Design a binder for this molecule. Sequence first.
Ligand SMILES: *[C@@H]1O[C@H](CO)[C@@H](O[C@@H]2O[C@H](CO)[C@@H](O)[C@H](O)[C@H]2NC(C)=O)[C@H](O)[C@H]1NC(C)=O
Ligand SMILES: *[C@@H]1O[C@H](CO)[C@@H](O[C@@H]2O[C@H](CO)[C@@H](O)[C@H](O)[C@H]2NC(C)=O)[C@H](O)[C@H]1NC(C)=O
Ligand SMILES: *[C@@H]1O[C@H](CO)[C@@H](O[C@@H]2O[C@H](CO)[C@@H](O)[C@H](O)[C@H]2NC(C)=O)[C@H](O)[C@H]1NC(C)=O
Ligand SMILES: *[C@@H]1O[C@H](CO)[C@@H](O[C@@H]2O[C@H](CO)[C@@H](O)[C@H](O)[C@H]2NC(C)=O)[C@H](O)[C@H]1NC(C)=O
Ligand SMILES: *[C@@H]1O[C@H](CO)[C@@H](O[C@@H]2O[C@H](CO)[C@@H](O)[C@H](O)[C@H]2NC(C)=O)[C@H](O)[C@H]1NC(C)=O
Ligand SMILES: *[C@@H]1O[C@H](CO)[C@@H](O)[C@H](O)[C@H]1NC(C)=O
Ligand SMILES: *[C@@H]1O[C@H](CO)[C@@H](O)[C@H](O)[C@H]1NC(C)=O
Ligand SMILES: *[C@@H]1O[C@H](CO)[C@@H](O)[C@H](O)[C@H]1NC(C)=O
Ligand SMILES: *[C@@H]1O[C@H](CO)[C@@H](O)[C@H](O)[C@H]1NC(C)=O
Ligand SMILES: *[C@@H]1O[C@H](CO)[C@@H](O)[C@H](O)[C@H]1NC(C)=O
Ligand SMILES: *[C@@H]1O[C@H](CO)[C@@H](O)[C@H](O)[C@H]1NC(C)=O
Ligand SMILES: *[C@@H]1O[C@H](CO)[C@@H](O)[C@H](O)[C@H]1NC(C)=O
Ligand SMILES: *[C@@H]1O[C@H](CO)[C@@H](O)[C@H](O)[C@H]1NC(C)=O
Ligand SMILES: *[C@@H]1O[C@H](CO)[C@@H](O)[C@H](O)[C@H]1NC(C)=O
Ligand SMILES: *[C@@H]1O[C@H](CO)[C@@H](O)[C@H](O)[C@H]1NC(C)=O
Lengths: 49, 187, 433, 198
Amino acid sequence: TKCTLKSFTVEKGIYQTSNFRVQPTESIVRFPNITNLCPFGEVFNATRF
Amino acid sequence: LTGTGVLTESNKKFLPFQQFGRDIADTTDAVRDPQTLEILDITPCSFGGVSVITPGTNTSNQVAVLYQDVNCTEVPVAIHADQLTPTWRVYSTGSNVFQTRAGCLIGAEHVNNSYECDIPIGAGICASYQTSQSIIAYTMSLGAENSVAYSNNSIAIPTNFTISVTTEILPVSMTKTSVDCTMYICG
Amino acid sequence: YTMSLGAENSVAYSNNSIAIPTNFTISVTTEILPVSMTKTSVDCTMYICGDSTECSNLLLQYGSFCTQLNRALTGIAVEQDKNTQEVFAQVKQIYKTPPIKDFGGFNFSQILPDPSKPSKRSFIEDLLFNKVTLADAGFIKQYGDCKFNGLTVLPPLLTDEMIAQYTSALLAGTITSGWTFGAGAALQIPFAMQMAYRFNGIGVTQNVLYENQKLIANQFNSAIGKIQDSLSSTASALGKLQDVVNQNAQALNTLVKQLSSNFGAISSVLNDILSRLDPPEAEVQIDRLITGRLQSLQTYVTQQLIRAAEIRASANLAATKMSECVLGQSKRVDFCGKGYHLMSFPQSAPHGVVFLHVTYVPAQEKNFTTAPAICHDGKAHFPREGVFVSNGTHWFVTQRNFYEPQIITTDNTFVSGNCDVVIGIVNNTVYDP
Amino acid sequence: SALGKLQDVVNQNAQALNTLVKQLSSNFGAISSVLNDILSRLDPPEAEVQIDRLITGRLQSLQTYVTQQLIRAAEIRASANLAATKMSECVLGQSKRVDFCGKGYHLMSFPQSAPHGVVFLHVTYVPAQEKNFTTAPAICHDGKAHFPREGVFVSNGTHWFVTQRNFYEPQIITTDNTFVSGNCDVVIGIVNNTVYDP
Ligand SMILES: *[C@@H]1O[C@H](CO)[C@@H](O[C@@H]2O[C@H](CO)[C@@H](O)[C@H](O)[C@H]2NC(C)=O)[C@H](O)[C@H]1NC(C)=O
Ligand SMILES: *[C@@H]1O[C@H](CO)[C@@H](O[C@@H]2O[C@H](CO)[C@@H](O)[C@H](O)[C@H]2NC(C)=O)[C@H](O)[C@H]1NC(C)=O
Ligand SMILES: *[C@@H]1O[C@H](CO)[C@@H](O[C@@H]2O[C@H](CO)[C@@H](O)[C@H](O)[C@H]2NC(C)=O)[C@H](O)[C@H]1NC(C)=O
Ligand SMILES: *[C@@H]1O[C@H](CO)[C@@H](O[C@@H]2O[C@H](CO)[C@@H](O)[C@H](O)[C@H]2NC(C)=O)[C@H](O)[C@H]1NC(C)=O
Ligand SMILES: *[C@@H]1O[C@H](CO)[C@@H](O[C@@H]2O[C@H](CO)[C@@H](O)[C@H](O)[C@H]2NC(C)=O)[C@H](O)[C@H]1NC(C)=O
Ligand SMILES: *[C@@H]1O[C@H](CO)[C@@H](O)[C@H](O)[C@H]1NC(C)=O
Ligand SMILES: *[C@@H]1O[C@H](CO)[C@@H](O)[C@H](O)[C@H]1NC(C)=O
Ligand SMILES: *[C@@H]1O[C@H](CO)[C@@H](O)[C@H](O)[C@H]1NC(C)=O
Ligand SMILES: *[C@@H]1O[C@H](CO)[C@@H](O)[C@H](O)[C@H]1NC(C)=O
Ligand SMILES: *[C@@H]1O[C@H](CO)[C@@H](O)[C@H](O)[C@H]1NC(C)=O
Ligand SMILES: *[C@@H]1O[C@H](CO)[C@@H](O)[C@H](O)[C@H]1NC(C)=O
Ligand SMILES: *[C@@H]1O[C@H](CO)[C@@H](O)[C@H](O)[C@H]1NC(C)=O
Ligand SMILES: *[C@@H]1O[C@H](CO)[C@@H](O)[C@H](O)[C@H]1NC(C)=O
Ligand SMILES: *[C@@H]1O[C@H](CO)[C@@H](O)[C@H](O)[C@H]1NC(C)=O
Ligand SMILES: *[C@@H]1O[C@H](CO)[C@@H](O)[C@H](O)[C@H]1NC(C)=O
């Protein structure tokens, strides 16, 4: 309240403040099931080039 | 889609072909996990609905905190009390923890006696600094109750009187400000 | 068509012809006034830059726009609380009606609190609460179920139970004491004698009440019944109040919809801008977005300020009506319903008040011959309080607003001058008791 | 604190101005909030962009300040109109409007100036000490019903007086205090008594 009002002294009353309290945030990444795989198996391990 | 928030078990029933929920402002509300066919509600992790009740720093430095529309068990998870300074964890749990219809009030001693409102909190609850001294929260009083001894053949007539001088203050004028536009913008 | 102003009605004016009512009606009208808005609050940092450190750092360059917007909204909410406080909290104590309802035959059961109820609201209060739908709001309805997006609706300081208690105290004070409870300590008085006071206050002798008391009571009850029917029939009556709500909702809705605007940037989504462009140009894009959202917030705040000024004017008017209308008896014409004012009864409503104005309306009118004075013995006699009338043969003196002829006597009339001055004086005999 | 309402106003204006001053410290997206530094560090090709950013930001601040001033001035004008009406109907006359000139019945008012405002001292009359009495809406005397001209009938237990309704001043009931109308078979609650005839 003191800094949000830009003063070292605070009068009586109920002030509405901001939200300075930060919190550490982890990261998550989600993608669908891996499907639709190329023919690389038969391209690299092909019988004859 | 990408975003920031808290993922919680949802209650909705997404259609078989819908993936991402959406509010009326084209904003993500719930999502379907790409691997597990479960719907997760995304509640943003930030609380700005926090009010600080304080008596004047001249009188004391004790304060109370009001969190808007929360239960008293959801407070250390709504504001993430576990990742806060330990001096903020005083004002997230404890013994002075009232549950008003407006939210969670912390640091105010809940009393039963009603008094004239001093610092309005909300939903009929007002707080004040009183006696050794501490902050108290109470259902504000609307005035001392009374009963009129009314009957069809009884009248109350005054016999004395008082000349009362009351004071009504009304603002009349402001300060005649003047701004030099070009000097202010382009001095 | 070319709209008609009203029904043509020529008045049969004549220099010696007066029209005096012979009967009346006790009419109850309804006056609806808004008293408060919804105490909306916006978390500006979370609205503009919801959970994004870089966006918050960029927004911190723009100084204290965000702070002053929050301060303005807090002032608005405080002003609404003050408006409600000043309109309703005008009684020092909390009176309650006695169990006996011997109110001279008048039936107040539709405005006094209902005993078998937890909210202590009257029938009309329940009607008003059930006639204010919230299905057309959108944001104000979806937030009441819990729209957590940095926008919150603070609850009013005085709960509906407290507002009902205040209206109950005012109503009980008015019924059981008249106007004394407003000036100071409540001084009891039979309700019939209070209505006699009011009739004297409108220039109608008190006996008129006592000679037609039951009929008037029935009329009042009937009028209250009609009000019930109106509330039961027309939902749109409280339009104004609903409109207010709607307007606020629309504002909020507009504000919310502004989150979907690019304001000239490449995308309305902050994260896409951050991930897609290099910082030198992502900074320009986020500056565009910040300027756009700040302008939207400024427009919303200005509209809220103007609408709150409107609501403050309405609340001041409502407080003045409560002071001069309930706590007393006003002589201001059409200030407390059409007709001569008798009394008024407040009733709560969602973010507003509804006054039932009980007024007196002349109904059945008769033509009488009139004179400006009467000449008895060369002297001119004028009525002390009333007017001379003639049914064709004899001259009586009656009160102006109700035909009650009385023999002309030296106690009804006062002498002044002689009969050579007054233009239109007639000859008659002033009986001397 | 009694005159807080005035101070608030003053304070608000000050705050406004103060904020305006602090608004000169903002970049609004520019590379510096100081015009002199931008002019000393950049050529017109990019000084134009920086100064445009500064101009837009400061113009927005000015517009916000002006709109706030306009709305607050409208409020203060409404309050001043109310004060003018209060002076017209409160000092220069005698208002029967309840609570419009202080709690209680209005007697008079005295105005006093004050920095950016006025203070009304409302002198009002307030009943203090009260007594119960038995009352009747009217009294029969000779079959005919008598109603009080101004005031109500009261009884201290044995006798009946007629008193004005704002101050207990019991007077003997006579034919100059009461007027006749009809007969007393209609009034509900009427009581028998004698009307002394001078
Ligand atoms: C004044 O008007 C009222 C209503 O028009 C009259 O009351 C009516 O009286 C008749 C018989 O006299 C009844 O049949 C009606 O039912 C009454 N109306 C209502 C609404 O109750 C009243 O008599 C009139 N009085 C005078 C002096 O004209
Ligand atoms: C006042 O009017 C109400 C009507 O709103 C009366 O209530 C009705 O009373 C009758 C008989 O007493 C019942 O049959 C009805 O069911 C009641 N209706 C409601 C809605 O309560 C009430 O009795 C009247 N009071 C007096 C003293 O006459
Ligand atoms: C005007 O009113 C007076 C009094 O009301 C009438 O005088 C009385 O009229 C009744 C009949 O209506 C007679 O029985 C009385 O004898 C009359 N009294 C006197 C002293 O003569 C008068 O008749 C009315 N005149 C008109 C034209 O209606
Ligand atoms: C009510 O007041 C009246 C008058 O104020 C009292 O009348 C008294 O009557 C007796 C005999 O009739 C006189 O001797 C007294 O002088 C009267 N009093 C006065 C003040 O003049 C009456 O007694 C009072 N009754 C009650 C019950 O208080
Ligand atoms: C006031 O006095 C009159 C008498 O002058 C009372 O009238 C009598 O009433 C009774 C019953 O109430 C009848 O039996 C008598 O015949 C009536 N007398 C006359 C002359 O009419 C009247 O009741 C008294 N009032 C009160 C309230 O008691
Ligand atoms: C080719 O076969 C070997 C084993 O025989 C396997 O490890 C490798 O992954 C195969 N290559 C591709 C492209 O699948
Ligand atoms: C992904 O795989 C898991 C288990 O293999 C399965 O339960 C789930 O339904 C799959 N989802 C999709 C979208 O294929
Ligand atoms: C708080 O607890 C009550 C149960 O008493 C519950 O109804 C309410 O939903 C809870 N609040 C929230 C925000 O879930
Ligand atoms: C208030 O009263 C309730 C009973 O209604 C009681 O349970 C509670 O302990 C009381 N609290 C205080 C602080 O007196
Ligand atoms: C009225 O009150 C004043 C002051 O309290 C007192 O001096 C005076 O005697 C009182 N008058 C009566 C008639 O009681
Ligand atoms: C009064 O007289 C005029 C014409 O002289 C007539 O039009 C009107 O209807 C009359 N009204 C009554 C109540 O008699
Ligand atoms: C009225 O009376 C006066 C004397 O009192 C007389 O002079 C006059 O002629 C009379 N007028 C009429 C119309 O009777
Ligand atoms: C009314 O007007 C007529 C016509 O001019 C006139 O003869 C009569 O004296 C007037 N009477 C009054 C009372 O004005
Ligand atoms: C009037 O009577 C009521 C009924 O008991 C009582 O409570 C009250 O104190 C009385 N007041 C006076 C002034 O006698
Ligand atoms: C007052 O009411 C009672 C019953 O409630 C009745 O007996 C009495 O006659 C009434 N008195 C008056 C003056 O109305």
